[model samples]
Target: MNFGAFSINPAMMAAAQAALQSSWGMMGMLASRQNQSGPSGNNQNQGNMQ
Candidate 1:
């Protein structure tokens, strides 16, 4: 079997993109939470503070 001949399923590609977007949002939330500790608080505020 030639690896170059392999094709990606469109449905799986769509699912992967959706999952990546979701994970990115979750990671953003986590990063925002970490930014509240005062040491790295100067970055994105995420509207949680003033």
Candidate 2:
């Protein structure tokens, strides 16, 4: 998180931090959507395997 102290310049550090935050935000949304679909949604897909 302390990219400001990193070897790279501040502008690059800021860009890096921004990209990291954006990607993590997207992942969080996907995770939340998966959870919202309920456990049965996951179980139903696995039920076909056996």
Candidate 3:
């Protein structure tokens, strides 16, 4: 499928990059912290020691 030719300006690309940066970076850090500290993290130790 084609939606015809399209283009993005530098400003538009910069805005999207900035918006996406916070999502997977800091947001991911917070989620990673939570997953480690949450109750589910204990399951890891019970699974395997090797």
Candidate 4:
């Protein structure tokens, strides 16, 4: 027996694509924040440890 049938629901595909784009957008926001913080952010943390 060989089964070779594959199907994708259009609604599910759209939802999945939207979710992927949302996650990518979140990642971009996090990266931008990190860039803005820079090495000065690490120094602030190290000072707190002392």
Candidate 5:
């Protein structure tokens, strides 16, 4: 339950943002249609780890 406004889970949001960025990059590479890492291996990062 939120007090003023509802919020989204940061983990989910990060994942979404990453996905969109990747998709945009893929679209830039693709001429026909739009479609869609790193090392260091952080187990604590939700989006990267998960």
Candidate 6:
């Protein structure tokens, strides 16, 4: 499979990339944790909130 800004063959793609690299290209990611907390005193937990 190939991707923009770079290319790779189907063979060895897994080992050639993610498994062996600290760095990568043509990719995206999400943080393991995020700011789940919103503005304080917002009372998101309150029921019947409009």
Clashes of each: 0, 0, 0, 0, 0, 0
For residues 1-50, could you state the per-residue lDDT of candidate 5 as single tens digits? 67756866589778888898767555445667533356555666567643
Residue 14 lDDT in candidate 4: 84
How well does candidate 1 match the true structure in TM-score terms? 0.34
Q: Write the per-residue lDDT of candidate 3 for residues 19-48, one digit (tens) a residue.
A: 987667665556755544557546566677
Candidate 1 residue-wise lDDT, 15-35, digit = tens: 998898777666565676553
Give the TM-score (vs. native) of candidate 4: 0.33
Candidate 5 positional error at 32, Å: 3.9
Q: Pick the candidate with the highest lDDT.
A: 1
Model 6 over residues 1-50: C-alpha lDDT tens digits? 44574654576776666655555332334444445465754656666455
Residue pairs with clashing backbones, model 1: none
What is the full ranking by TM-score, best candidate first? 1, 2, 4, 5, 3, 6
Where does candidate 3 clash, by residue pair? none
For candidate 3, the 10 contiguous residues with the lowest summed lDDT are 1-10
- The residue ranges of model 3 lying beyond 4 angstroms of the native Cα positions read 1-9, 27-29, 32-50
TM-score of each: 0.34, 0.34, 0.30, 0.33, 0.31, 0.17
lDDT of 4 by residue, 1-50 (tens): 33644655489778888898777656655676555545554655544854
Stretches of candidate 1 off by over 4 Å are: 1-9, 27-33, 36-50
